[PDB]
Subunit: 86 residues, 3 copies
Amino acid sequence: SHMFTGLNTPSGVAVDSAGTVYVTDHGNNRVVKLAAGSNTQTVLPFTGLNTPSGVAVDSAGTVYVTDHGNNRVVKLAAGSNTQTVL
Amino acid sequence: GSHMFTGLNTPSGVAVDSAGTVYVTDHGNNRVVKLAAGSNTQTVLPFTGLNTPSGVAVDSAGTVYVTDHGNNRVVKLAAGSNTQTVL
Amino acid sequence: SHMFTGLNTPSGVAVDSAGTVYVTDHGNNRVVKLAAGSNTQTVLPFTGLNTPSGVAVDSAGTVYVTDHGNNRVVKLAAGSNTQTVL
């Protein structure tokens, strides 16, 4: 399908219960998702990322990211636009 | 003895499904390997053209997703399929 | 506060149904987990880790780690103090 766009050295991938795929776009300091059937990726409203290294999603839809370049972990609840720093 | 991963080079990621099958991105060897309960030899999954894969996920249907880091892309492979899809 | 502390170039993250978060603390050769409910981080008793690159946790609570610097994968069952090399 080839619809993710503009990735550089992507570092991790997670897939949630709805089949949405999440990718840490390491080389571009962002996290992108692609819903099942979608032809347009969405950049998640994480903020201040630096070379993110990995991602997980739990069964409640919360997305967790290791923000490698900032020595921290951040998370984003499903339907939230505002990250929590862990 | 067997039921061991062999030949791994700078492995980058791991995923496990509820059947207990372990999936590993063998970064240095441009390949993805898995090992199921009761299998004494690992399987190299038939992805194509990988370079330095960085991470892996597996969904409920057993489809394997890989960040093909060296090629700036994500690919997936359904269980038992030999033809990957680029995402 | 509810956060990981003392991380260095963290490489990967996993999460379980109870809300526990697990991180490969790559720069410090360790794996740490953070309690869902409190400000408690626990160092898992893996042995000889070297720049670990990734982590997974299964339904039984077994923690799996790609031990990047040692070209191996190791696991630790919930409640065990003894890792198994895969």
